[PDB]
Amino acid sequence: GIKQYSQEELKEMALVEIAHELFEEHKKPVPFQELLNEIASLLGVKKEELGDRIAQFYTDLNIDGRFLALSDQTWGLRSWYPYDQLDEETQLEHHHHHH
């Protein structure tokens, strides 16, 4: 799954951490609902069953240290500009422990 994560490793991570890797795999910008539909599919669930996790994901992602929204609906991964990885999987979910 995605780079090297099997389903159990994905299901244990925050939806935003999945979203980083999904985007690091994608390297393209995705609308919220469509990205969510891919997340839904990664987890093997219906997006409606996520209930609380929807609002959580939205709140988490929208104030996240990763992601940048392009026009409005779409979100894009930040790695396509300088910071600590320029489109390279050199980081693999950048928790960035200190430096």
Side-chain angles (χ1 to χ4, degrees):
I2 301 171
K3 181 66 190 186
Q4 52 176 89
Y5 304 89
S6 190
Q7 297 301 147
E8 294 304 271
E9 296 73 65
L10 291 174
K11 296 166 52 188
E12 61 173 74
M13 299 192 302
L15 300 179
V16 62
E17 300 177 284
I18 304 179
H20 175 268
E21 302 301 86
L22 183 62
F23 264 96
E24 220 61 89
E25 174 265 81
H26 287 349
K27 295 183 175 185
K28 51 70 74 68
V30 197
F32 181 83
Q33 71 100 152
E34 295 189 79
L35 165 65
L36 181 64
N37 190 33
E38 292 182 66
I39 298 176
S41 305
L42 297 175
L43 184 58
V45 299
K46 298 161 70 288
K47 66 205 66 167
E48 318 84 85
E49 315 303 305
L50 295 176
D52 173 89
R53 290 304 196 218
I54 298 298
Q56 179 58 89
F57 176 89
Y58 188 89
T59 309
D60 196 309
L61 189 78
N62 290 213
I63 64 178
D64 188 36
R66 311 74 148 199
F67 299 68
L68 53 80
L70 296 299
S71 312
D72 177 54
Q73 62 186 90
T74 45
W75 286 94
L77 215 288
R78 305 181 68 203
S79 303
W80 314 317
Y81 67 28
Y83 63 105
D84 72 347
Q85 69 211 271
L86 179 63
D87 183 277
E88 192 52 82
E89 53 183 66
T90 178
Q91 296 290 87
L92 294 170
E93 216 313 272
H94 88 130
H95 302 99
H96 194 108
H97 69 97
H98 192 80
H99 65 102

